[PDB]
Short mmCIF file of C-alpha atoms and ligand atoms in Angstrom, two decimals:
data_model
loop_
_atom_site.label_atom_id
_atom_site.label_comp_id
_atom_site.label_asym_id
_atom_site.label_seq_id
_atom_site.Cartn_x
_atom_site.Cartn_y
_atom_site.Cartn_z
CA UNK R 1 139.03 114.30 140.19
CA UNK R 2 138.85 112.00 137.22
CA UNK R 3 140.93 113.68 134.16
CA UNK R 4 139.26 111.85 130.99
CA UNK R 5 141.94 112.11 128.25
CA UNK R 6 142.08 111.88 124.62
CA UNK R 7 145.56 112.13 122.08
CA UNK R 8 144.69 113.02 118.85
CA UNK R 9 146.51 113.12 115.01
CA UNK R 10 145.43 114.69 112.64
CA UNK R 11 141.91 115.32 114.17
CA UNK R 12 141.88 111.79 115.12
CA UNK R 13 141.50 109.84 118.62
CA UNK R 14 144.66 107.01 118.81
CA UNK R 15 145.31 104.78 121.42
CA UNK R 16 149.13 104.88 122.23
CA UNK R 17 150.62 101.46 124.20
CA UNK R 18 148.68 103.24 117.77
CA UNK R 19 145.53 102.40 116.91
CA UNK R 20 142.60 104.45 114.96
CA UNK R 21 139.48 105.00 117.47
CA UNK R 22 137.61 107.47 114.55
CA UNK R 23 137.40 110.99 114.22
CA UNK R 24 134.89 111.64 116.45
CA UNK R 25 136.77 113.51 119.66
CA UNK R 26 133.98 116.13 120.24
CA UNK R 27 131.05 113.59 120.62
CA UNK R 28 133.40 111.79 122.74
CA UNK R 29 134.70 114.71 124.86
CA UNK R 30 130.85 116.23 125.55
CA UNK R 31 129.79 112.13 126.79
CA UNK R 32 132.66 112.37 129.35
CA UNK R 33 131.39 115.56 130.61
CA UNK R 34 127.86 114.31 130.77
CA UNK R 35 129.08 111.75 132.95
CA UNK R 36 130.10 114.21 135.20
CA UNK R 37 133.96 115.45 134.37
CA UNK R 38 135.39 118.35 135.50
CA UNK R 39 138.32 118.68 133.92
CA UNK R 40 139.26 117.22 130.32
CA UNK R 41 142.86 116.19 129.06
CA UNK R 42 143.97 116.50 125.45
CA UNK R 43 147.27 115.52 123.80
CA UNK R 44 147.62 117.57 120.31
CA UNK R 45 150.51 114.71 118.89
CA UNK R 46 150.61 116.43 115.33
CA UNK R 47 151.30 119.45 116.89
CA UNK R 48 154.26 117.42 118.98
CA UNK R 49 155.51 116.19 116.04
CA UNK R 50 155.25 119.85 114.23
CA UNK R 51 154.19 123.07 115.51
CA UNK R 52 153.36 124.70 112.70
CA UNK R 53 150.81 122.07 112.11
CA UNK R 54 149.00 122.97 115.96
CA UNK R 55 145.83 121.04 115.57
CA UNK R 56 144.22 125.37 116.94
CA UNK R 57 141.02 125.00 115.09
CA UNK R 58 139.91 121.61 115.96
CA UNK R 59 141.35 122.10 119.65
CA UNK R 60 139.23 125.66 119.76
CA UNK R 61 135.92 123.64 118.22
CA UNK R 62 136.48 121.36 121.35
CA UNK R 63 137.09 123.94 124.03
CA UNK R 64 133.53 125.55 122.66
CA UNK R 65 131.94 122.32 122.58
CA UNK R 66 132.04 121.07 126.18
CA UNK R 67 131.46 123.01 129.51
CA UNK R 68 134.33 121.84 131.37
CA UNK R 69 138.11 123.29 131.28
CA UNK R 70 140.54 121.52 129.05
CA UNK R 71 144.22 121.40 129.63
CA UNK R 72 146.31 120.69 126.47
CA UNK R 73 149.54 119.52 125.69
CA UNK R 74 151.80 118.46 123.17
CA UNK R 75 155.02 120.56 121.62
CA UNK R 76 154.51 123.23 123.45
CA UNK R 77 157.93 124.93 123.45
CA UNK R 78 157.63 128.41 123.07
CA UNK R 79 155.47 131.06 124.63
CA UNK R 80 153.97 131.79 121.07
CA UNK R 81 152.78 128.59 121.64
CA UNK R 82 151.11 129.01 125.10
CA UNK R 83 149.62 132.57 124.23
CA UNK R 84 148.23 130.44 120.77
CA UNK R 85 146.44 127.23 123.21
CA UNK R 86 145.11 129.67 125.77
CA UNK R 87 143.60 132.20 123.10
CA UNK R 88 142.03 129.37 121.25
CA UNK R 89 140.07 129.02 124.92
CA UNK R 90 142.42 126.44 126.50
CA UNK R 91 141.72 126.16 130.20
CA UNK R 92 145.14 125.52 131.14
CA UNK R 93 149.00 124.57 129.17
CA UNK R 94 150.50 121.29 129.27
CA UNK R 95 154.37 121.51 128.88
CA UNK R 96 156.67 118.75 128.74
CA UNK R 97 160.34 118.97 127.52
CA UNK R 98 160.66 122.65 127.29
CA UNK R 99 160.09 122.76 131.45
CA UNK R 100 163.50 120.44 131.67
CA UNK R 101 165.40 121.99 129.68
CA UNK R 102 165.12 125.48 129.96
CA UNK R 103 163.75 126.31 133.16
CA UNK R 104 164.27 129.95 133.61
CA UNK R 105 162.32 130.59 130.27
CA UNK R 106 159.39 128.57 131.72
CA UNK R 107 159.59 130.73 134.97
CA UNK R 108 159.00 133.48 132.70
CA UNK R 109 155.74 131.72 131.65
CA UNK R 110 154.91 131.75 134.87
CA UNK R 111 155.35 135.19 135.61
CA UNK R 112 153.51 136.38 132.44
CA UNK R 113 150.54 133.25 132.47
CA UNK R 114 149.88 132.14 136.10
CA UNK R 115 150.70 129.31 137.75
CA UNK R 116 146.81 128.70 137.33
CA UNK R 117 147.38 128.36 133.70
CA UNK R 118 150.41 125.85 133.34
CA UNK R 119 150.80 121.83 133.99
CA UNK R 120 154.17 120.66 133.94
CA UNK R 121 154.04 117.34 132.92
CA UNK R 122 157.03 115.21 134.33
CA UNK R 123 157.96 112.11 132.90
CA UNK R 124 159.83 110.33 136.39
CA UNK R 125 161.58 106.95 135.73
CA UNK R 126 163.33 105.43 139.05
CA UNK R 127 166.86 104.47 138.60
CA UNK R 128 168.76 101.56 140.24
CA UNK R 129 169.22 103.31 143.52
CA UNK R 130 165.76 104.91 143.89
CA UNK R 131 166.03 108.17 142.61
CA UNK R 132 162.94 109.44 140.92
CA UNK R 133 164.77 110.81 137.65
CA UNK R 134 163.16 113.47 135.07
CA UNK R 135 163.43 112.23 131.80
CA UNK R 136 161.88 114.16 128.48
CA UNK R 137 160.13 111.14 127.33
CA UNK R 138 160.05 107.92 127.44
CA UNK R 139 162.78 106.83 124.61
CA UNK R 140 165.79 108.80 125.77
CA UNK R 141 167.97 108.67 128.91
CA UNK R 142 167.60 110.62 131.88
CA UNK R 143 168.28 114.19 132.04
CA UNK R 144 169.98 114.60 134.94
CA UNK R 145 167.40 115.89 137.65
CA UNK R 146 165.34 114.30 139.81
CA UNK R 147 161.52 114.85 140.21
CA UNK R 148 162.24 116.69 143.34
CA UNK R 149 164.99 119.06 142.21
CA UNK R 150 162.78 120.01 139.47
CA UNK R 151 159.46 120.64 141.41
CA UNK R 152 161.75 122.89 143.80
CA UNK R 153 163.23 124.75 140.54
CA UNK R 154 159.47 126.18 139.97
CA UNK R 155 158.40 126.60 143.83
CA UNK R 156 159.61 129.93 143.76
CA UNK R 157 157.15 131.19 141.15
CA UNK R 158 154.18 129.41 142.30
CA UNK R 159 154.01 126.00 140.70
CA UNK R 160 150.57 124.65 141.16
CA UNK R 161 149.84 121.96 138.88
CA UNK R 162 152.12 118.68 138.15
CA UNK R 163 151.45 115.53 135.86
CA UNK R 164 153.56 113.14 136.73
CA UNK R 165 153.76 109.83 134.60
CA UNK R 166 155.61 106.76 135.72
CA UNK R 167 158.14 105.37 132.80
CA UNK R 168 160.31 102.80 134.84
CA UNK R 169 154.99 101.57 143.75
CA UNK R 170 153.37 103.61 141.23
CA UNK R 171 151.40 104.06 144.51
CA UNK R 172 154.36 104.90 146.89
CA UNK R 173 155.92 107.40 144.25
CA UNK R 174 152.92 109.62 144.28
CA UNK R 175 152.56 108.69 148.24
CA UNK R 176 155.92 110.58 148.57
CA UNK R 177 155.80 113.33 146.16
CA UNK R 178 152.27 114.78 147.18
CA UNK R 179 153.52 113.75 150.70
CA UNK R 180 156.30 116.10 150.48
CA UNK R 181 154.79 118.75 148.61
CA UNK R 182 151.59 119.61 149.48
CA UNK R 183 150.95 123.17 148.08
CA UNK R 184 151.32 121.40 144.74
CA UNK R 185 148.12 119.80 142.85
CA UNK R 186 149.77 116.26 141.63
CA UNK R 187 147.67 114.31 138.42
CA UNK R 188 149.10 111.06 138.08
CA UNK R 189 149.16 109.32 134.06
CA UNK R 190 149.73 106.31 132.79
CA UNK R 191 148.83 102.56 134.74
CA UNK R 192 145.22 102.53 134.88
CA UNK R 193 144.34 99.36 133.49
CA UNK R 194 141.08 98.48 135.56
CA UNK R 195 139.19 100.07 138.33
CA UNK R 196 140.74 98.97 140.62
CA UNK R 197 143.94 100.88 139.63
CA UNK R 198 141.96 104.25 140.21
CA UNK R 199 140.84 102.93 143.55
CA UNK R 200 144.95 102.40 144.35
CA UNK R 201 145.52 106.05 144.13
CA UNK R 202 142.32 107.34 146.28
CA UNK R 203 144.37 107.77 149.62
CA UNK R 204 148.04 108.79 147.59
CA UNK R 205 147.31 112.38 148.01
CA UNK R 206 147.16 113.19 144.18
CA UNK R 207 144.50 115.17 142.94
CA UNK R 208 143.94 114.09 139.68
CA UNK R 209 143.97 110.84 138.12
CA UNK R 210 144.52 111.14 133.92
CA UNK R 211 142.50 107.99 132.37
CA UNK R 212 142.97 107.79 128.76
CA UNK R 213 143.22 104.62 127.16
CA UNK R 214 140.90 102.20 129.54
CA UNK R 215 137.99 104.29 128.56
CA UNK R 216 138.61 103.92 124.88
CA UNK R 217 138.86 100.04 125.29
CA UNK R 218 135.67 100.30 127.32
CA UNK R 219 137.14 98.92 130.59
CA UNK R 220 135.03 101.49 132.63
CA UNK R 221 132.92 104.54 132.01
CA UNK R 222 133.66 107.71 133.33
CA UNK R 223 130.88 107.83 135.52
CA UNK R 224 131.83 104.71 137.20
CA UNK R 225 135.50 106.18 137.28
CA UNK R 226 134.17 108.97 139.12
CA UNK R 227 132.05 106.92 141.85
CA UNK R 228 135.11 104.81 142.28
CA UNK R 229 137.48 107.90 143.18
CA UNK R 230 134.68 109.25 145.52
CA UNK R 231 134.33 106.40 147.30
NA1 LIG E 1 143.69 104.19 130.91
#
């Protein structure tokens, strides 16, 4: 499916390449659904930046407003933090850094939350001899393990859901990982500049295809995002 996505500051909707696109994110959010949406991204960035600052009572006005689930990430490094997102009616947890670097405290997560609850969002760069490497984001070096290493660390306690964004083709990379795991539910993020880059990943094998920014630049509508990945 087509995973419209918004990042918001401060109860604001930014582009990131930032730019201010108003403060209107439920309006926004419900027209996306309308269109026909299943599934909703949001990026909390203030709460990336600080925690204690968890955008929870715009994010819960959100969740109420639409009909759809909503899967939200951004900082979410302890499981304080998870319990808070999926209280405040959160369909399902986006985390980031925290799943590199302390894996056996996210397989706890998993244990206590459901697989059905968690996205692991991966940030893959290839290296120099084709390795698809993890890195935390997308202004530090690589940590070390590869996309696949990773993925395999979480098999064991029922990792469903990946988001995989490329940081270093795009088509071949999610060719092979949803190729080579196929229990797991891969949404790809970042690239999609035009329709035709949505119509690229149709026969990858991913499952979900995050379109933020092409939207807000009115490239597309989500309807015709969604007749495009039918097709
Ligand atoms: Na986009």
């Amino acid at each position: 499916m087509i995973i419209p996505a918004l990042d918001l500051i401060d109860g604001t909707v930014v582009r990131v390449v930032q730019r201010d696109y108003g403060n209107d994110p439920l309006p926004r959010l419900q027209d996306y659904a309308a269109q026909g949406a299943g599934v909703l991204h949001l990026v909390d960035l203030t709460g990336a930046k600080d925690p204690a600052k968890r955008q929870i009572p715009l994010i819960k006005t959100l969740v109420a407003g639409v009909n759809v689930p909503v899967q939200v990430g951004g900082g979410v490094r302890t499981e304080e933090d998870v319990a808070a997102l999926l209280k405040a009616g959160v369909a399902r947890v986006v985390i980031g850094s925290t799943a590199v670097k302390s894996p056996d405290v996210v397989k706890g997560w998993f244990e206590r939350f459901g697989a059905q609850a968690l996205v692991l969002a991966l940030d893959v760069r290839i290296d120099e001899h084709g390795t698809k490497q993890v890195a935390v984001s997308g202004w530090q070096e690589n940590s070390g393990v590869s996309l696949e290493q990773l993925v395999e660390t979480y098999l064991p306690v029922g990792l469903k859901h990946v988001l995989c964004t490329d940081i270093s083709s795009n088509v071949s990379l999610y060719e092979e990982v949803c190729a080579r795991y196929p229990q797991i539910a891969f949404q790809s993020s970042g690239g999609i500049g035009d329709i035709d880059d949505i119509a690229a990943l149709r026969g990858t094998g991913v499952r979900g295809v995050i379109v933020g920014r092409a939207l807000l630049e009115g490239k597309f509508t989500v309807k015709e995002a969604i007749q495009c990945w039918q097709n």
